[PDB]
Design a protein around this nucleic acid. Structure first.
Lengths: 22, 172, 129, 158, 145, 63
RNA sequence: UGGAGGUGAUUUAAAUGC
RNA sequence: GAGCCCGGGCUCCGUGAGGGGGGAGAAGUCGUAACAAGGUAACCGUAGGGGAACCUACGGCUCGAUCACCUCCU
RNA sequence: ACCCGGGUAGUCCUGGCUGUAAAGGAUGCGGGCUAGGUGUCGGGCGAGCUUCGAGCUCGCCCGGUGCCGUAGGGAAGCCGUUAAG
RNA sequence: GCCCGAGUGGUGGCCACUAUUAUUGGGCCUAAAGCGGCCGUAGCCGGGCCCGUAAGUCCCUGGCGAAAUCCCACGGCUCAACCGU
RNA sequence: AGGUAGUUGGUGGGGUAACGGCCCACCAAGCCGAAGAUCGGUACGGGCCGUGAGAGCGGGAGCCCGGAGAUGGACACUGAGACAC
């Protein structure tokens, strides 16, 4: 679980933060 | 306002008491019962709060609430704020107009009585009345009668016959 | 550190009580406690005490009858009017009978019942019943 | 009894004599006592150790009990014997020993700086000084214009 | 010390504490801001009339299936799209498209659609200023336009 | 100990009479430090744990 | 009689079911 | 000395292609992740990698594993 | 992927940054009060033993570190003078 | 058949229940929830003993917080609501 | 989370029914702020009101009491009084 979520949250964050940074 | 209904209205033990009371005194609605409960509650509440406080607070407050209960007649010749709390919803109901009309022997039975005062077949003092609630004082008991009435203007109203067959007063 | 030395006296005294030892020792000692035990003895709750004043400290050795149920200090030590007494009467005490809500007063120190008979009040100090 | 400060460890239970007036099987005059004190402060010893040697050699456990009454304003004891003469350090010994030590630390750290623990007691000794300062100001052994710092610690010692 | 400062002059700390910790009641926070009043259209109101855009029927929830009668109505001043649950059996009948339909809530404003219905926050009372429970009984009045 | 029933230290006093000069000194049964004779320069006692260990034979009267 | 460690560990036994 | 106007800046209301997630629907598919040592104990913070559940490294923790082997404790 | 054979960053050192955890005893800190028992570490004390050193042991005390348990608390597990009284 | 009764019921809001906002009167090992640990500023909170003031604090008097509403009495309206004293 | 430039104060003066940075000339650099200022939201305020065993919580409706307004916004006369439903 919290492994999952942390990396899902991180990936969401990055990918989206990539989309914001871009 | 002028009513109360306990936290839970459909409760059996509360409802039983009433329905037995309801026939006993022959109310028209429950509200009437309630009137007297809620009236009883206030005397108690106050009687209690007064006794409790510091004895130096103008004692007039106590006197006053013992005076009225004497005059009304609930209290006879007892001197404690604790007897007041020893009243019940039955005692108040004994004090009504309706009750007191059947008692004296002005009416055959309380159900009959409900008819009489409405159409103005009971005089009190010099006045007629329409409200069977009417709180009847002790001093006021002696002055219930007939004068310009259908029960007593003659001696051949069947009304006189209906009251005579019974002849029983007492608690209603 | 300590504060409320009184209270740390009283609280022993009660937890002392609840066990049912015979007598107590209270290592820190004072007027407050001294006086309060005095008034306490005056009502009778306790038997006899001796304090020995050591160059360190007063200590009270107290004799326990068995009477005391519960006797505690007041936390912020509220001021209480002589009209508000009745409120603080109903709350803290167990019933009308007992009457040692020990307050501190203009006259000195008293219980609740000794306060009411005079007629004077103030900030609360502790209780006993 | 205890206070586990910068520790979890209950403090020593060392306890005073419950004597309130002094031994008379021990015997010294107000004059003799005063000499002993002055001689020891002349050595370079300090008041705690002055009270220590007098205890171990001359058999006087604390000075207050023996001396007062001889001017019953208050108890007469070591440094109050010293101040009347002018032998007292204007800094209280309390505050002095403290600061004294402190300046030694700094020099270690100077040469050795990779020291957690040694760094961490610098922080633990200053903050006792600070306090000891703070209240004295208000009591008045140290003027209100002062404030504590590591250059104003290296000036008081030298 | 069980939390709180107790002390004569401290009270202010008390006074701010409560308030700080009050805002963990969703309901309290929400009203004191007025989120109840801003979000779930109405502008707060008891009820709202609106023009029946169309009639739609939706599915029931998890243990359940049955065609609930729902309208789509547009509140007029609110100007907001509301899908809605219609009381009664036959009903969907007595409601013509483009009659006025007064709308209310149903069963706590919290958002809670009743157990069966997913969405529906709201209720309908009326068709052309005469209600639905009056149109389930044949005698009382019957509809127009 | 007896911290709430009056704490009294373990202590006592004992009159020590020097064996090198006959000098009479009052000594705390617990020497914390080296006590020095005032007319010999000797050591009567040495400080270790608890009670100062008395160095060799020195006369004693126990108070 | 009941509790805490330190390390061998065993692959010869297979995914899912409204 | 108002309203009024003009040029620019900032903010807010009605409304918009497109875009994010939630509580769901539980008849399609992939896998077996966890819950039994779940069949490689599990979790944990950090880092990389994999379609997915997840795997691995390093450090921690037992809310840790089943005998066995060794060690202590009323 | 578990298993095996290679393998970079890293693991080490120096200076700096970063600041997270099941960073636990999942138990903030300080004071006072409230049966006990036992093992253990260090310090004190009165003895016996001695290799004449507190080396081997008995008991009281002080500080710490475990386990068991009375009264009490707890929802229960448990906690219970190292409190969760 | 039960309730209530010229009312009774629906939606919405507020208060009670909810010691689910803890002053009265809540918790925080494992249920939500202890900061990973310390320091000390602002704050709150403070050992004993004597003397001054009497700022808080209590007591008494005195100026004053309109009427109304509330509570109690008596009186008025047939009764009460309502009003008057 | 820092704000403040008639801005805080001083001297002298104007204007006003009148004190006053109200306004103004000169001089000074204060004034306010984590005991939460400033800014943003919301809102007439009070007597009361609802509810609740109490403590408390919510509320400003008739009515009374005080202030503000009169299509938005500014402006004077006339009168003791208006910048005038």
């Amino acid at each position: 679980m919290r492994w999952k979520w942390i990396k899902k949250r991180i990936r969401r964050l990055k990918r989206q933060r990539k989309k914001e940074r871009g | 306002k002028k009513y109360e209904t306990p936290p839970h209205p459909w409760i059996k033990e509360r409802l039983d008491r009433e329905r037995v009371l309801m026939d006993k005194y022959e109310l028209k609605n429950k509200k009437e019962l309630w009137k007297h409960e809620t009236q009883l509650k206030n005397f108690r509440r106050r009687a209690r709060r007064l006794l409790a406080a510091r004895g130096k607070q103008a004692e007039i407050e106590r006197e006053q609430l013992l005076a009225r209960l004497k005059r009304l007649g609930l209290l006879p010749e007892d001197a404690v704020l604790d007897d007041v709390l020893s009243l019940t919803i039955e005692d108040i109901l004994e004090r009504r107009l309706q009750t007191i009309v059947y008692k004296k022997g002005l009416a055959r039975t309380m159900r009959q009585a409900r008819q009489l005062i409405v159409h103005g077949h009971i005089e009190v003092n010099g006045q007629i009345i329409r409200s069977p609630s009417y709180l009847v004082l002790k001093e006021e008991e002696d002055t219930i009668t007939y004068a310009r009435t259908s029960p007593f203007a003659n001696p051949q109203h069947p009304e006189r016959m209906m009251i005579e067959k019974a002849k029983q007063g007492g608690e209603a | 550190t300590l504060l409320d030395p009184l209270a740390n006296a009283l609280s022993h005294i009660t937890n002392s009580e609840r066990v049912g030892k015979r007598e107590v020792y209270i290592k820190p000692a004072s007027k407050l406690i001294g006086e309060v035990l005095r008034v306490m003895q005056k009502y009778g709750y306790i038997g006899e005490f001796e304090f020995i004043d050591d160059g360190r400290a007063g200590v009270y050795r107290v004799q326990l009858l068995g009477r005391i149920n519960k006797a505690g200090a007041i936390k912020p030590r509220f001021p209480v009017k002589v009209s508000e007494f009745e409120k603080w009467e109903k709350r803290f005490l167990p019933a009308f009978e007992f009457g040692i809500l020990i307050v501190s007063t203009s006259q000195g120190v008293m219980s609740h019942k000794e306060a009411i008979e005079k007629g004077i009040g103030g900030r609360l100090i502790a209780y006993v019943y | 009894m205890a206070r586990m400060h910068a520790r979890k460890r209950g403090k020593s239970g060392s306890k005073r004599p419950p004597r309130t007036a002094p031994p008379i099987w021990v015997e010294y005059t107000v004059e003799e006592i005063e000499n002993l004190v002055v001689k020891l402060r002349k050595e370079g010893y300090s008041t705690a150790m002055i009270g220590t040697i007098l205890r171990d050699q001359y058999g006087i456990p604390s000075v207050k009990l023996f001396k007062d009454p001889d001017n019953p304003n208050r108890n007469l004891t070591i440094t109050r014997i010293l101040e009347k003469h002018g032998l007292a350090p204007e800094i209280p010994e309390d505050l002095m020993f403290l600061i004294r030590r402190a300046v030694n630390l700094r020099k270690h750290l100077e040469q050795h700086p990779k020291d957690l623990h040694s760094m961490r007691g610098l922080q633990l000794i200053e903050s006792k000084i600070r306090r000891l300062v703070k209240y004295y100001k208000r009591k008045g052994k140290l003027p209100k214009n002062w404030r504590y710092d590591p250059e104003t610690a290296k000036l008081l010692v030298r | 010390g069980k939390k709180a400062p107790n002390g004569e002059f401290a009270g202010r700390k008390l006074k701010l504490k409560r308030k700080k910790f009050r805002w963990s009641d969703i309901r309290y926070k929400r009203r004191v801001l007025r989120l109840k009043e801003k979000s779930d259209p109405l502008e707060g109101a008891p009820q709202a009339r609106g023009i029946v855009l169309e009639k739609i029927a939706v599915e029931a929830k998890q243990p359940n299936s049955g065609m609930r009668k729902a309208v789509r109505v547009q509140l007029i001043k609110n100007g907001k799209v509301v899908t809605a649950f219609c009381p009664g059996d036959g009903a969907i009948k007595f409601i013509d498209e483009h009659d006025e339909v007064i709308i209310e809530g149903i069963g706590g404003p919290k958002g809670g659609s009743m157990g069966d219905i997913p969405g529906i926050r709201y209720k309908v009372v009326k068709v052309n200023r005469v209600s639905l429970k009056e149109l389930v009984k044949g005698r009382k009045e019957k509809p127009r336009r | 100990m007896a911290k709430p029933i009056i704490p009294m230290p373990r202590s006592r006093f004992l009159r020590v009479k020097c064996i090198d000069c006959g000098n009479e000194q009052i000594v705390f049964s617990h020497p914390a430090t080296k006590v020095r004779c005032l007319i010999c320069g000797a050591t009567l006692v040495e400080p270790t744990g608890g009670k100062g260990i008395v160095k060799a034979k020195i006369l004693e009267v126990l108070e």
